[PDB]
Ligand binder design. Sequence first.
Ligand SMILES: C[SH](C)CCC(=O)O
Length: 280
Amino acid sequence: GLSAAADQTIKIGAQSMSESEIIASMLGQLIEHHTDLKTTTIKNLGSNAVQQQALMNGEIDIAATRYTGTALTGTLRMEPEKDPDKALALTQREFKKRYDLKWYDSYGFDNTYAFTVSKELADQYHLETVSDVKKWAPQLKLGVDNYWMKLKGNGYQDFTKTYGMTFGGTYPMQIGLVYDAVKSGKMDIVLAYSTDGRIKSYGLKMLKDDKQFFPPYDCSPVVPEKVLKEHPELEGIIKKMLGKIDTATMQELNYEVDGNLKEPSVVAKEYLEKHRYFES
Ligand SMILES: C[SH](C)CCC(=O)O
């Protein structure tokens, strides 16, 4: 019954990404900093859709990182809203209405799909925007994640319609591999994730999505209203992380895992100590 609520463990989900492991660790540590709640991390959820079902079936009590553009198209099956503020507002409204899920305001960073080349390619062919690559598309191999080609929504098929180009070859692979694939010249162009730490490190160039094909992908935690009711301290704790972690910061945190070979929990703890757990 209710008087046992404070002895329940808060299960925090992470997708198969370094960024999601870092944020799920950081939120679990902040919750334990403030309360006597135990927390655990449920790792390796494969996708937006898996995080969704784990929230609805009790497998996780908090999804640490969900992305507006992904959930708009993929969960809600709505037309992709292009304005950041409108997309967030629509997502929060529909998540509450449809699922009784609370989609919080963003941590402060967006992690968008970004068409990405070597700085050498971009400098040789004067490539700044996605529209600049149109005339070259047939002679480029595009590396993509193991998930993006199968999206009916803001996927490849609609991309080719809006930009009127088709790549010579498309090669789906684990996201973590696209950075070295483009750096080594195995791929000519990759659909990277914009908060990856290796983009800067590896000397890569993101091309502007001048036609605004992509929705925003602002990142937030998502929690069932039932969990917030039963643990009324959680909302005030979650709020402490919101709007505090910008894209540059998330890139540096990702680099600590993928480039400096640190455990996501260690990266999360050192960030919390550097910033005094968000209140000094
Ligand atoms: C963060 S978007 C670049 C792709 C990953 C996802 O949304 O699941």
